[PDB]
Amino acid sequence: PFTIDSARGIFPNTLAADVVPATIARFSQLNAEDQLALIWFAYLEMGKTLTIAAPGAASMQLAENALKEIQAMGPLQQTQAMCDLANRADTPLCRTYASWSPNIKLGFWYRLGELMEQGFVAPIPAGYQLSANANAVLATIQGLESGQQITVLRNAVVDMGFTAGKDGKRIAEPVVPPQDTASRTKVSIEGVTNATVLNYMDNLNANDFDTLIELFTSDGALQPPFQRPIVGKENVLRFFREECQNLKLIPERGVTEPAEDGFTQIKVTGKVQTPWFGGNVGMNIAWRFLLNPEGKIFFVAIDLLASPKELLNF
Ligand SMILES: CC1=C(/C=C/C(C)=C/C=C/C(C)=C/C=C/C=C(C)/C=C/C=C(C)/C=C/C2=C(C)C(=O)CCC2(C)C)C(C)(C)CCC1=O
Ligand SMILES: [Cl-]
């Protein structure tokens, strides 16, 4: 209950899927052309059984100029531009890309994937063979659960490009209006009646970010899977609005324990769906809450779990 960084240690039994950042670190070592080929390979195979949802119209508008610029290049330049993004080179295209929210980056690559499939953007060279390190990285990816697979792909996409400056322009999709109160569903969590946890889940499922943020302490933090804590209401609300639209949280069961100084620690396990895959991918998730004596959220961590065997009382 003293520091955000120490609260990171609550529920230390929770086995997170650290194969995801491990695999991202291996991927990030590879030659840029192998990075592009590997994801092409993974994308094609995954597309045999899982269809990515189409990017939103606003997103496509925001990426359109950059996409047109690439589409106007000769093939060798197209390949160089994509390598620039993978290498995190400092170029105008890489700076534009870095200014984008994850969803806009994902929609940019969604479009390039379609154009490569159609032959209008320089495809991976025919008969391309991955490097020794890259073939093993792909093998690991293809052995993971789909929820882990899609998280590796997102993290590879978000990592590309070049950030120059701390207070650089941030481009994101417009904020969706919250769900009308009448049509809202309420979660049920075995073992957990805590109103702050239930209101957390219900407000996020309704895209009601202004209500959600009011659950937090001023200095409170939210820790997304495999990322550092996002600290204080402005940064956490920013994150909700830019990155947390149209999720479906399906918490199942939890446990509630006292913590030092009248705090309460609560662990919930369940599933989450991203709007990119809808009901076809259910990620296995834990939430770890540290609530102050008044019930506000001092800290919440969201963990991608190593296996369904990490869900409480499987
Ligand atoms: C790149 C590339 C390509 C294309 C690649 C493409 C098109 C790849 C596309 C990949 C896509 C669309 C991946 C989407 C992933 C989404 C995830 C993991 C969302 C998780 C959300 C969670 C867990 C949120 C949970 C949350 C909960 C519960 C909270 O309680 C609080 C909020 C929080 C957010 C934390 C080509 C194919 C063209 C080849 C070349 C190449 O490189
Ligand atoms: Cl998402």
DSSP the chain: ---HHHHTTSSTT--B-THHHHHHHHHHHS-HHHHHHHHHHHHHHHTTT-PPPPPPHHHHHHHHHHHHHHHHS-HHHHHHHHHHHHHT--SHHHHHHHTB-HHHHHHHHHHHHHHHHHTSSPPSPTT----HHHHHHHHHHHHS-HHHHHHHHHHHHHH-S----SS---B-PPPPPPPPGGG-----BBTB--HHHHHHHHHHHTT-HHHHHTTEEEEEEEE-TTSPPEESHHHHHHHHHHH-TT-EEEEEEEEEEE-GGG-EEEEEEEEEE-TTTGGG--EEEEEEEEE-TTS-EEEEEEEEBSSGGGSTT-
Beta carbons within 10 angstroms of residue 28's beta carbon: 14
Residue 2 lies inside a defined structural domain of this protein: no
Q: Are 30 and 156 contained in the same domain?
A: yes
CB neighbour list of residue 84: distance below 8 Å, 6 or more residues apart? 91, 93, 94
Residue 237 lies inside a defined structural domain of this protein: yes
Residue nearest to atom 29 of ligand 1 (CA): 302
Q: Are 22 and 162 contained in the same domain?
A: yes
72 is in an annotated binding site: no
Q: Are 28 and 156 contained in the same domain?
A: yes
Last residue of a domain, one of 135, 166, 197: 166
Distance in angstroms (rounded) separating the CA atoms of residues 290 and 266:
7
Atom of ligand 1 at shortest range from CA of 249: 28
The domain tally of the chain equals: 2
Q: Are 154 and 98 contained in the same domain?
A: yes
Residue 176 lies inside a defined structural domain of this protein: no
Determined by: X-ray
State which of 274, 284, 297, 300 you would mutate to test the pocket of ligand 1, scoring each by most atoms of that ligand within 8 A of its C-beta: 274
Distance in angstroms (rounded) separating the CA atoms of residues 76 and 129:
19
What's the CA-to-centroid distance between 248 and ligand 1, angstroms? 14
What's the CA-to-centroid distance between 276 and ligand 1, angstroms? 7
Q: Are 79 and 49 contained in the same domain?
A: yes
Q: Which two tokens stand for residue 267?
A: 């662990």
Atom of ligand 1 at shortest range from CA of 85: 42
Q: Are 162 and 192 contained in the same domain?
A: no
Residue 48 lies inside a defined structural domain of this protein: yes
Phi and psi angles of residue 206, each rounded to the nearest 5 degrees, phi first: -95, 0
Q: Are 154 and 191 contained in the same domain?
A: no
Q: Domain limits at 237?
A: 187-314
Ligand with smallest separation from the Cα of 240 = 1
Distance in angstroms (rounded) separating the CA atoms of residues 213 and 204:
10
Residue 177 lies inside a defined structural domain of this protein: no
The answer to whether 161 and 94 have CB atoms below 8 angstroms apart is yes
Distance in angstroms (rounded) separating the CA atoms of residues 198 and 212:
11
Q: Are 26 and 121 contained in the same domain?
A: yes
Q: Are 102 and 23 contained in the same domain?
A: yes
Q: Are 157 and 28 contained in the same domain?
A: yes
158 is in an annotated binding site: yes
Atom of ligand 1 at shortest range from CA of 110: 7
83 is in an annotated binding site: no
127 is in an annotated binding site: yes
Distance in angstroms (rounded) separating the CA atoms of residues 243 and 88:
22
Residue 7 lies inside a defined structural domain of this protein: no
Distance in angstroms (rounded) separating the CA atoms of residues 219 and 297:
9
Q: Are 53 and 153 contained in the same domain?
A: yes
Print burial letters for 35-74: b (CB count within 10 Å at least 16), e (below 16): bbbbbbbbbeebeeeeebeebbeebbebbeebbeebeeee
Residue 4 lies inside a defined structural domain of this protein: no
Residue 12 lies inside a defined structural domain of this protein: no
Q: Report CA 151 to chain centroid distance, whole Å.
A: 6
Q: Are 117 and 195 contained in the same domain?
A: no
